[PDB]
DNA sequence: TGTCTTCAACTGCTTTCGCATGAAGTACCTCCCAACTACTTTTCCTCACACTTG
């Protein structure tokens, strides 16, 4: 029933200017932040795209 | 009147990030509590003596 609402029009001038929003599971088009507490470099926390891996 | 020098006392830190799993102080005091035994408590039960009789 909500999938059908995700697209509903505006109700209030007070919100009209916004979308709603989806709060939406991690996905293999998303980057994320790796860190290795060693941190002792910037080269030690990198950024890798995320590929869900079934049965992990 | 003025400026300088050493020593000892005082200040602040000296790996990061998480699991465990939190527990334990205690003197002085006690009033409450649990105890053993005896004593006490409430209802009930049943007999008994004297004067008089003949």
């Given at each position: 029933?909500?999938?059908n609402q995700l697209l509903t029009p505006s109700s209030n001038?007070?919100?009209?200017?916004l979308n709603?929003?989806?709060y939406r599971?991690?996905?293999?088009?998303d980057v994320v932040?790796?860190?290795?507490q060693p941190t002792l470099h910037k080269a030690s926390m990198m950024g890798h795209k995320v590929?869900?891996?079934?049965?992990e």
């Open positions: 029933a909500l999938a001038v007070s919100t009209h200017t709603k929003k989806v599971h991690i996905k293999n088009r932040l790796m860190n290795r590929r869900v891996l079934p049965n």
